Every structure is written in structure tokens, then in C-alpha cells.
Amino acid sequence: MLSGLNHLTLAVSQLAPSVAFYQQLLGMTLHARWDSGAYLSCGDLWLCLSLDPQRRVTPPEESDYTHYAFSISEADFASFAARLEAAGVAVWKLNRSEGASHYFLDPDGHKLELHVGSLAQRLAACREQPYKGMVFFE
Template sequence: MLNGFNHLTLAVTDLSRSLDFYSRLLNFRPAATWDAGAYLTLGELWLCLSLGKGSDAQDSSTYTHYAFSIQQSDFHAFKQRLKNSGVTEWQPNRSEGDSFYFLDPDGHPLEAHVGSLSSRLAECRAKPYKGMQFFD
């Protein structure tokens, strides 16, 4: 049912520093930035930088997760199968497209996501996050 890697979200403690590191030193291309985050690309990779809630590494790492792509037609059956198997959901979906946020047996945070960076940016253009800027 999962059909590929979708995106990587990294919680960061200093957005400006991280944006500079990934764009200037690693050659990621900014797609959009806002007060609490940024979307960048490197080839087909979609990277989200998300400002952490706290100042220590333990607190800021809570939103780091790996997302996998899934078709809309498979999403609800996949989510139900995982829930029926006792998989732990670690947060509700609050963004564009259906997502199921769940933990693997070792507690690694994962996400099954319907959508792409293109669909996310289209939604953000309609309803931008605070301070959002787009790079075309």
C-alpha cells in the first residue's frame, strides 16, 4: 500500500541557521519559508524544517519524522489495518492531505501521507502560514 518515500520533517531549534545550512552548504533549494518552518527540495527529496517547541534538543526533536507516500484509495484501509494491529498514533493530522502519524515498534515516528510538495504548496498559497514566502 505504501508506494515510496514522501518527505522528511526535521525539528530544528534555529530556523535561520538550519535554512542557511541546508540551502547554502548542502544546495537544497527553498520552495517556501514561513515564521515556523521551511520547505526545501533536493532533486526529488522534499524536506520540511519545523521550528521546535522548546530550546533543548530533547523537546525540539519531537516532530522529526519520516513520511511515506500512499494513494488516497488505499489510505483508509491502511490506517484501519494499522489501528487494528495496535499501532500507536502519535499525533492527529493537522495539514493538507490525509495523513496517519504512527510509531514503529522501536518508537520511530512515521507518517503515511496522501499528497506531495506540489499539493502542499497549492494549499499554502490558498491559506498561507504566518509569514509565508514562496520561491518560484
């Protein structure tokens, strides 16, 4: 029925710092901006920043595990993490899963992630060392 993710929309408290975070720091392409939002792209990903007066800057301990992971090469992983570290971007988790992951927060506390690895690679690793109670479906 569904063919993929059409877009991701993030509620932001301040449009300008969020645009700066995703365009200048993360390198996404800014396509349009208006008084209450912005459209950016990251590969095939359509990202909408939506100005929301209800959005507070949320500490990572006060939000659940819902998060959004962006693909990055193994070759770029270390330097991109250092770039984030130089900018003072907070880390909310340390990786314990297959593939390289860097868990960082956006200006409003949206939980983000850089990840090296596909679903196929994760499934193959899990076949070798399954999670508790793991069942596979073909």
C-alpha cells in the same frame, strides 16, 4: 549537487520485530538481512534497519518532531490505517495539514506517517491559505 535521498537508515533495538513491522505489516520488500541489519525497499526508497544497542523504545512525548512519511493513495488510506489499528500500532498525532495523514510509531518509537499528497499540492494549498509569515521562492 545532490540528486535525492540515497537511503534512510533507522537504528533498531531488535532486528526481528522491526523487520516484521516494515516487511509484513507495512508491505515493504525485504532484499537482504544479516546479523546486525536488513535492507528493504519501498518504491524508490532504500531503507536500512541497523541494529543499535543504544536504541531504546522512545515514547512519542520524549522525541522531537523529526519523522518520516511514506506515500499512500487516497483509496488505500483508510484500509491501511485500519490495518495499523488492528495491529495495535500507536498514533502519535492527529492530522491538521493539507492532504490525508496518519501518524504512527514503529516498534522503537520512530515517528512515521502515511501521507496522501505531493509537495506541489501542498504548495498550491499554502498559496491559498499561507502559514504565518510564509514567503514563496521561484
